[PDB]
Structure 1
Amino acid sequence: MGTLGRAIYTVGNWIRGTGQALDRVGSLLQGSHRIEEHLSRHRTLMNVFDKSPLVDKDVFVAPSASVIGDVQIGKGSSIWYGCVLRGDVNNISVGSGTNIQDNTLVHVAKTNISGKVLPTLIGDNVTVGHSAVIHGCTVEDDAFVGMGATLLDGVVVEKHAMVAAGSLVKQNTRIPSGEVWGGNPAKFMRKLTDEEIVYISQSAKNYINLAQIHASENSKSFEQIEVERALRKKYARKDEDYDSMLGITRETPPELILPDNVLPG
């Protein structure tokens, strides 16, 4: 503060002007070839055709996800990094406690080649694996869709049914309850054991828990990010022997401790 503070601030202004001038000169020397980085224009939630996505309070939507148009997402659901939910020509509905994994595409159609064109309906407690493609089809509650699987228009995945990782499910195919289908084209592989039904449920609840920590981290402000960076650096290593000499016990701050429901045990 005071006169010294003001003088140092003015000198900082001069230094900033000089630095930005040097940056401009360096840009000129590069032949202006470098496209400049800019403020991020990606919108996590966007309207189109006067349709606004309806997203429940406690839904993790990763900032890099794209939720566009007429999309409804229910309680406890999670949309992960790089997901695209494009509800522009038709409706997309996601039930409660359903996870849409990273880099997944969900889309709809305005008019199919033949039959009744239907919206994309994803039920409750559904797991959809990484990089899946869901197009104009219906996934009923407690179903599992493997990573990298493709569901074409009119496909119905029934309750407690599984689509294996990597499968290509042709248009209008029906996956009956209790069966697992896979391959390209997808076809019946075998019945689902009871332990696998329990797995599907477990998948869904584990995701519900994972979504909480990811949502908490992605929503932190600049100041909290800096505070936690400093705290993480301070507690990354230890000298418990010198602490015992000092007669103190350093405790990990609670903002660095994860909840027990996401820990391996």
Structure 2
Amino acid sequence: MSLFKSSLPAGFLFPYRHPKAKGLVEGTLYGLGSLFRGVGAALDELGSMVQGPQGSVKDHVQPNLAFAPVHRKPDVPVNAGQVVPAPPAAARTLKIKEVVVPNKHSTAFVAANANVLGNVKLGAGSSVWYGAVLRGDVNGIEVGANSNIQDNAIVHVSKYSMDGTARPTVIGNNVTIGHAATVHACTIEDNCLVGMGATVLDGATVKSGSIVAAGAVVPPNTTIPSGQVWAGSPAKFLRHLEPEEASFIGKSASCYAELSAIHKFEQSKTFEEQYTESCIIKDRAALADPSNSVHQMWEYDSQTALVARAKR
């Protein structure tokens, strides 16, 4: 119900894909288009043949690795992910009966180019950001509620170690994992912060309300007690927590909840919505001219660039 809801042509309403052709002219144009598509793809393939061995590499869409399975192992218990039945094609081809996919809460945000695989649990309101690697393949990965794993951070677990201990990675609630941080087979308690570019190694414990500083390397089997800040390579004691930094940790968690909302809103739009929005952006820039001849008769809706009402 803008003003012309029953008179707009179908090409204007559906810019991503026009409906079926009816008349002679439109069908002739459609046939010419199919001929052009055939000849163009043929010339593309012939050019790839003339080009050489580099032409054998083709353009293919990539799999969705944000929600990806791993092998169900008999020695590995599944405590973070969920065991789902295998697809029938996989079963009849290469002998798969059960795979392990992650347990993802409905309010969590995962980046479209992140890699979250297998035995991983993602809590409510939590977030995994662009380029992050969460590979739960030989043990479990747990991420608590309102926790963020930031850009290009690596999370991994161990089944076989130097000292023969299988260790999962558990991340508590309201935890911020910094940019390009390395989290490997260790425990992060509630309301902690790991600095950007820092490394926490196997079997180290970060107790609640502590901060690992930027660039720090936490050696294996090290316990960082509550209300302390550690820094350096290898990390030693630096300071006690300030009164303000403890509230800063919660501020950081709330800020990434608010940010993950906006990023999930932008990411989860379909192709048809994105193409309609590009056509709307084009119409809005055409309407930004104050000398546009429609400005003296029609008033346009700001968010959709449709005619809302007659101006005069």
Task: Give the TM-score of the pair, scaled to structure 2.
Answer: 0.75
| Residue 4 (str. 1) matches residue 53 (str. 2) | no
Aligned pairs for 1:81-160 (under 5 A) are 81-114=130-163, 116-160=165-209
Larger Rg belongs to: 2
Task: Quote how far apart the aligned CAs of 1:114 are.
Answer: 2.7
Aligned counterpart for 2:256 among listed residues 188, 204, 207: 207
Deviations 1:76-126 (A, max 9, x none): 000111111111111111100000001111111113323753311100010
Aligned pairs for 1:1-265 (under 5 A) are 1-34=22-55, 35-48=57-70, 49=72, 50-114=99-163, 116-235=165-284, 239=288, 246=296, 252-253=302-303
Task: Quote how far apart the aligned CAs of 1:201 are.
Answer: 0.7
Structure 2 regions of 5+ residues with no counterpart? 1-21, 73-98, 305-312
* 1:257 alignment counterpart: none
Deviations 1:187-211 (A, max 9, x none): 1111111111111110000000100
Structure 1 regions of 5+ residues with no counterpart? 255-265
Q: Structure 1 residues 144 and 250 mapped into 2: Cα distance closer, same or farther (>3 Å)? A: farther
Deviations 1:101-154 (A, max 9, x none): 011111111133237533111000100011111011000011000111100011
The question of whether the paired residues in 1 share the 8 Å contact of 2:177 and 2:193 is answered with yes
Further displaced range: 190-199 or 111-120: 111-120
The question of whether the paired residues in 1 share the 8 Å contact of 2:174 and 2:191 is answered with yes
Further displaced range: 5-14 or 214-223: 5-14
Further displaced range: 163-172 or 20-29: 20-29
Which 4+ stretches in 1 moved above 6 angstroms?
Answer: 247-251
- Distance (Å, rounded) in 1 between the aligned partners of 2:286 and 2:175: 40
- Distance (Å, rounded) in 1 between the aligned partners of 2:224 and 2:129: 25
AA at the equivalent of 2:203: G
Q: Structure 1 residues 9 and 241 mapped into 2: Cα distance closer, same or farther (>3 Å)? A: closer
**Secondary structure, in 3 states, of the residue corresponding to 2:54?**
coil
The question of whether the paired residues in 1 share the 8 Å contact of 2:198 and 2:217 is answered with yes
Further displaced range: 43-52 or 212-221: 43-52
Further displaced range: 113-122 or 125-134: 113-122
- Distance (Å, rounded) in 2 between the aligned partners of 1:23 and 1:178: 63
- Distance (Å, rounded) in 2 between the aligned partners of 1:241 and 1:43: 47
The question of whether the paired residues in 1 share the 8 Å contact of 2:126 and 2:146 is answered with yes
Q: Structure 1 residues 149 and 29 mapped into 2: Cα distance closer, same or farther (>3 Å)? A: same
- Distance (Å, rounded) in 2 between the aligned partners of 1:247 and 1:179: 68
- Distance (Å, rounded) in 2 between the aligned partners of 1:61 and 1:45: 9
- Distance (Å, rounded) in 2 between the aligned partners of 1:198 and 1:209: 17
Task: Give the TM-score of the pair, scaled to structure 1.
Answer: 0.88
**Secondary structure, in 3 states, of the residue corresponding to 1:45?**
coil
